[PDB]
Write a structure and sequence with these properties.
The structure holds five protein chains of five kinds. By secondary structure, chain B is mainly β. In chain B, 0% of the residues lie in helices and 48% in strands. Chain B has a six-stranded mixed β-sheet with strand order 2-10-9-4-5-6, with no helix packed on it. In chain C, the strands form four sheets. Chain C has a five-stranded antiparallel β-sheet. A three-stranded mixed β-sheet of chain C has the order 2-12-4, with no helix packed on it. Chain C is globular. Chain C contains four helices and twelve strands; from the N terminus they run H-E-E-H-E-E-E-H-E-H-E-E-E-E-E-E. Chain C folds into two domains: 141 residues, no CATH class; 52 residues, no CATH class. By secondary structure, chain D is mainly beta. In chain D, strand 17 and strand 18 form a beta hairpin. Classes of the chains: A mainly beta, B mainly beta, C mainly beta, D mainly beta, E mainly beta. Chains in contact: A-C, A-E, B-C, B-D, C-D, C-E. The interface between A and E is large, with 45 and 51 residues. Bound molecules: 2-acetamido-2-deoxy-beta-D-glucopyranose and chloride ion. 2-acetamido-2-deoxy-beta-D-glucopyranose (NAG) binds next to helix 1 of chain C. It is classed as viral protein/immune system.
Chain lengths: 214, 214, 193, 213, 214
Amino acid sequence: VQLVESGGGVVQPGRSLRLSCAASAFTFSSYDMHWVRQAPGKGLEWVAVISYDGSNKYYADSVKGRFTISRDNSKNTLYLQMNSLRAEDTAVYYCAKDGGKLWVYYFDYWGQGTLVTVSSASTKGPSVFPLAPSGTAALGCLVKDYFPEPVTVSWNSGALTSGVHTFPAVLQSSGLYSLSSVVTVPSSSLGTQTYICNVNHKPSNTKVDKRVEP
Amino acid sequence: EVQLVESGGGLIQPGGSLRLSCAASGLTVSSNYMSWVRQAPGKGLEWVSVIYSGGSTFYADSVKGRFTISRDNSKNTLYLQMNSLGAEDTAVYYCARGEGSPGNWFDPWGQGTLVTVSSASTKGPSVFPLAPSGTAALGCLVKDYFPEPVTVSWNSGALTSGVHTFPAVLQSSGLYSLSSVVTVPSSSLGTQTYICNVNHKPSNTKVDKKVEPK
Amino acid sequence: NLCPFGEVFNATRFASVYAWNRKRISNCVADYSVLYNSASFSTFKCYGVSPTKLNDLCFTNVYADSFVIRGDEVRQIAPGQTGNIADYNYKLPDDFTGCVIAWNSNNLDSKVGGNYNYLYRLFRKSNLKPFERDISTEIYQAGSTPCNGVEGFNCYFPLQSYGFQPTNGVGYQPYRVVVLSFELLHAPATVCG
Amino acid sequence: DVVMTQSPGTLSLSPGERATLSCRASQSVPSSYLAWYQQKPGQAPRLLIYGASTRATGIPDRFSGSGSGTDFTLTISRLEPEDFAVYYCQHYDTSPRFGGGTKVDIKRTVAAPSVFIFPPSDEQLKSGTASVVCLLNNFYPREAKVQWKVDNALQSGNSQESVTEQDSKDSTYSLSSTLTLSKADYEKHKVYACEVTHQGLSSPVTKSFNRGE
Amino acid sequence: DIQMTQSPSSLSASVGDRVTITCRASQSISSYLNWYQQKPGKAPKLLIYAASSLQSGVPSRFSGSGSGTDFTLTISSLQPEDFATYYCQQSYSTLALTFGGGTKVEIKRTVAAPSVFIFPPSDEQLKSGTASVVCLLNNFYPREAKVQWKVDNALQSGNSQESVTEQDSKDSTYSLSSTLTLSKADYEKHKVYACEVTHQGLSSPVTKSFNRGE
Ligand SMILES: *[C@@H]1O[C@H](CO)[C@@H](O)[C@H](O)[C@H]1NC(C)=O
Ligand SMILES: [Cl-]
């Protein structure tokens, strides 16, 4: 049983966005379908449910009168129209097939999920700054002031794997994100081996290579 | 002969617990809506809890999880168990029949009892005469007690006309002090005995002081 | 033939919550889909059963209870609640199986001069059992001296008026409530979806 | 959930006048849910009016409540000195709510204070402390200046004042000023005096006593 | 609304250990309690439905039990792929489905000391206006570690934001990065910039400082 989501992206407060979820390999027109979101770092929150025929719709109080659920049984796709989006709607939205082996609801299969970020900030590119070292040593890079998520950071174009630690981003008070990535190397090969971090930001189309030297 | 007589107030340290009592005559506690309403010094009225005749209980958000209302039918008495007390719980606590709703107003009310949440200790007062020299003035000085309140009467209640009992003042030592005065005709100073009755309920300290010319 | 849910939902006049009505539904085919997508509901909460699953289930009897209450009191029509309505007027069991449906009825049940026909029980010695109905108007004794059916001090009429007025805030506005219970006995079922 | 707001904060009227106290809301509230409570100084609240307009048992006729929707009023005709109190409106939505209260002060004619000075008792002196008390009795308005002079030297920093509420019968105030010294300091000086200035006095009044005399 | 309380919020267990997770309901939910496993970056998967019914394809080592208000998930023999977050989800209130806060199951390794390093804000960062001081804790266990910023021996709180990488797949050790964000005007006014660290693998708090430009 497969469930594939799409339609997620960046949206401004008060605007609209529509998510889709295509089912496969089961009788889609006979089961109920759900939407469940998960804010970054937070837990799971059931959003909405739709009947097998699409006549009955039920929503959570946090989104009622603001989101709309629908489905097309001839296309085996589930929809979620999200209007008047507030910053608290920033989450990863999953679609779930209802189990059906009980009188009540439960989710037996889930979709992979797509990110929705509600913010009046624009798609800004990152600023990468190195971290020079001052019984081994360590050096890294600092991806600061970018929006939105995510950013991919590697070392030596993917050659330096062991000893690397990329830290989760934190949403600072400026609405932008800040991310740290370090790597520990032996203190002997500091002026001989060259270290360059590879930062990539697909939402803003930014690829930065920065030298890291003591 | 309808009365709600309260007891249980006094000093309690931060984080401690205390239990207030509301003894009723003229109504059956277990048969009524019974409420607690409190009043921080110099501030307004705040409903705290209610117990339904059927047993259900409800609490204001500010005391939920810390207070517990209950009753003893054989003693026809209402109780309030207060735990985890803090500065915000320092107040006069009233009981009342009713719950401030149609056909169910707050009536009657108890006389109230003062709960003082402090780290200090209970100290009984010292009483000293204010001796007099058309009309003359005499009184009683009630010094260095804690916590509030003290009450003062004159000649066991037989003397009320012209009595002024001042609000206590907090001395720089952390103890309270007040004076009670009364004006009387100058001619009765020699042929009439004047006694002030000081009652410091937190310590059950009752002092009678004869006030004579010097 | 179809089950008569419209005789409950579309009733012109509704019962006071203390004297809540109950319609026993039997020996009919229930069309829950059209029932739940008719009017717009301000509250729709089901316990122990899903609304979409009812079309597949069969029951011995289905009960449909209806009454009017205040907006602020709709939260009390749920398993495990307490309050003047749940304790003294209409009580659901802790293991309730069914759906609670409510909608604002300000247009139907509020009057310019105030509608005092809708009442609730204010005073009762003890809490109601689940699905218990109490229609007594005996003078309530709140003291030691008996009342002998005469109102007075500590002697209260047990019922209280709502007085619905169309300009009140929604907490004070009337709401019509329908509660669907699903009784599953070891008897041959008569109501299927 | 409806927030109700009382106005004004304080009302100052002469006896016999008409007092108008308002309780307003943003949403309309049914009149049957409105109550008023009176609380005199040191006493407990007393139910005045319930159901917006129904006078409680034993409440004098001069209190009456009215209004509906967003504007509830308490009226006190023929205002009396005993009516000095704080009045609260009250209603229930999901829990009992009380307004912030309106204080009713009572104006009266200017009254000069009677001044009395009290020496410390010999009993207290044996303990090592001397309290000298100055009483200002039955005056209006509240503004008063009390000055301690010890051997004609003005004192500051060693006294505390306390004022009563308006008297429920004559609407006056009373004030007490307590001068606090050590026994050793008290025995170093002879003349103890408090000087009072008030609107009712054409010139300041001084009461004094000689220690030992 | 029905609140689901899971305990503990996290646990550390080695492979083969028997793990039990507790899930409590604010009111009786009969038996309509479902368990879910969600891997970081992946969709949740159903494990147990209706308190005790195993889902098709779920390993036998998973089992659920309980009724009313107390429920339990049990892993009889923990396996390496069983390290994820486990949510319970009540379905008694079918139109108000709620989830528990979750229980993260992680690896219980031996205790290890962090390697603390401090970094000055770069010269390329001071040219922009801002300035960030980064302190690194590298390869320690357990996650609980206190990072304290001292600027001129003054405790700092609210100017920084921490970040932790997930447990390393090689040696199961964590890491920490604290970013003390300030502006260029708030920087050159001082000289000593230190970083205090409290951890289980330290006999006394280790502190790392640098002098600007040395
Ligand atoms: C109840 O009334 C609505 C419209 O007011 C109608 O659509 C519905 O069919 C009625 N119920 C029944 C059972 O006919
Ligand atoms: Cl006192």
